[PDB]
Design a protein around this ligand. Sequence first.
Ligand code: UAO
Length: 168
Amino acid sequence: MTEYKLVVVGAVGVGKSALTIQLIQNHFVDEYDPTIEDSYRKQVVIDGETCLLDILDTAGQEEYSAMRDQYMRTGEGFLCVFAINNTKSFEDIHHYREQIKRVKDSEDVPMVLVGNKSDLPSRTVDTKQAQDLARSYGIPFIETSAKTRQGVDDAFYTLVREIRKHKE
Ligand SMILES: O=C1CC[C@@H](c2cc3ccccc3[nH]2)N1
């Protein structure tokens, strides 16, 4: 059983932790909790092969900018979870791209783009904008949801799929 280091960062109010809880114990929390650092290790069967997802739900804030590089180096899988309502989180991906590139020492790395709370009527971030930017970075886009659960399981599957192509 191979373990995969997954670092989850982004903006605040996106519902990063909510997504993980939906996969870990299949539970949805309406109330928001200030997650500083949470370790979620669940064995998931990706494309027939069971892998151990070592997901680290951390806070991508300025107060953790000096510690971010610590886990980003060992991190293999990166879930770029942004919000469709909060267009600012969509622009925050630029800063992350620059940092991750510096921490990984590589421009081409295995990463996935996922938009949470896609079931919200307030869609500020347009699908074309997200899709276009996804191609620029070279990462796939998946519309996720913690309340409605829209292919959340497959979102994690595809993450490993991209990572596998970086090896084999
Ligand atoms: O001994 C430690 C301190 C950091 C923590 C950790 C790093 C990390 C990176 C990617 C994914 C999960 C991760 N968990 N383990």
